[PDB]
Design a protein around this ligand. Structure first.
Ligand SMILES: CCCN1CC(Oc2ccc([C@@H]3c4[nH]c5ccccc5c4C[C@@H](C)N3CC(C)(C)F)cc2)C1
Ligand SMILES: CCCN1CC(Oc2ccc([C@@H]3c4[nH]c5ccccc5c4C[C@@H](C)N3CC(C)(C)F)cc2)C1
Lengths: 213, 230
């Protein structure tokens, strides 16, 4: 929390999870791949500055509410350079008709990817967005206060990055807004995803992955 | 887009729909009252939407689609705003003030009440201002459905929508600056405010999911007919 903006970025970049491969019907592959990415997400979350300062109870709650959103923005980020296609894994690249109630979700994921592409979303930016999702998704006294301080710190970092890129102050606030409004759509996709399922990772499973002290 | 920030706020403040009342004269009545109230607010919402800058510049079908996507979000943020200075209560109408336990009377309603009450609590501890609220409501209208529209006309709509969003963002920053916030505090509050929209989306989806467990959404032509004036 005392880290500089530059230290925050580098920490988050270093904390980035690996790209996994699909173990190989299509629903089993997407399920299995999601299950394996979950473990690496948990270990990513532990390295997000300020996260392990929360109680384990609250860490689990945040992960319970954020896990699908984080899977999805990750999917969308690496699918950027592959228009009309979703790169779940290097050996699992699917289009919208391979989705044929998954096509609607595929479509939404595809639109979000094109949005990122259009915005020319940078790696240093995406990684901040992912941290914000983790901390923001489940927050609805000392703990909520801490979460909001970390969120504020990431906001600073995002603004710093845009300043470094040479964007004017007006462009900074405008780009910040565009990025955060995208999180609304990711939230929506996660909701529909959870709906199209009804499954979820239990409290105990997440707590186990967290590998307590 | 020629509007200044001051002119943006003014237009949004004038576009504000009226505060409506529940009928004048029971837990078995609750859902009926909440449904009747929602239907009546919908009418004023369409009029409000038309007076949001840039909205009527859009095609009628894109206008319908934005409202199909955002109508429950808009209802809810209005409710949350009305309830801000009434801790533990949801002010659906000045004569319809409900709490948690009254929500219990309907299956799965207490969870939605809790989320709405928590959002009201968030607005409270942020000391959300009226000028900020109408900006946030406008953003919901323009942003919620824009990612679920490739035709050339549609590409032009999206660019227009994103440019109006940019302007509302400029308006939000302006308001926070006049209030005397530092630059750092301005971006920080802008972020905090926009993050709440994620949760409002969340609530709309949970609530939409309730409704299908029991006319539940406005039909295309219903919204069309109200939007498609002569
Ligand atoms: C027991 C632990 C919980 N796991 C069961 C498993 O349930 C899922 C089943 C399918 C999906 C897919 C999926 N898989 C991914 C792998 C890497 C990155 C993105 C994804 C997604 C997003 C999306 C296609 N998911 C389908 C869904 C949930 C209906 F939207 C996500 C979760 C998560
Ligand atoms: C054209 C058909 C669509 N209308 C039928 C009507 O269905 C509803 C029935 C109940 C609700 C309530 C409700 N009512 C309000 C009145 C003014 C402002 C806010 C509200 C809300 C939010 C919330 C409590 N709604 C319940 C629910 C299930 C979450 F949608 C929302 C919609 C909307």
């Amino acid at each position: 929390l005392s880290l500089t903006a530059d230290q925050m970025v580098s920490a988050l970049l270093d904390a980035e999870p690996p790209i996994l491969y699909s173990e190989y019907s299509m629903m089993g592959l997407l399920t299995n791949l999601a299950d394996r990415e979950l473990v690496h997400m948990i270990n990513w979350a532990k390295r997000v500055p300020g996260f392990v300062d929360l109680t384990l109870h609250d860490q689990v709650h945040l992960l319970e509410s954020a896990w699908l959103e984080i899977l999805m923005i990750g999917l969308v980020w690496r699918s950027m350079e592959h228009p009309g296609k979703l790169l779940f894994a290097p050996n699992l690249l699917l289009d919208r008709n391979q989705g044929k109630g998954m096509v609607e979700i595929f479509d939404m994921l595809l639109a979000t990817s094109s949005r990122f592409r259009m915005m020319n979303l940078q790696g240093e930016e995406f990684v901040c967005l992912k941290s914000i999702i983790l901390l923001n998704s489940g927050v609805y006294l000392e703990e909520k206060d801490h979460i909001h301080r970390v969120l504020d710190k990431i906001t600073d970092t995002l603004i710093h990055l845009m300043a470094k890129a040479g964007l004017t102050l007006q462009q900074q606030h405008q780009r910040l807004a565009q990025l955060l409004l995208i999180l609304s759509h990711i939230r929506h996709m996660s909701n529909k995803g959870m709906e199209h399922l009804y499954v979820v990772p239990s409290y105990d499973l997440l707590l186990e992955m967290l590998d307590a002290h």
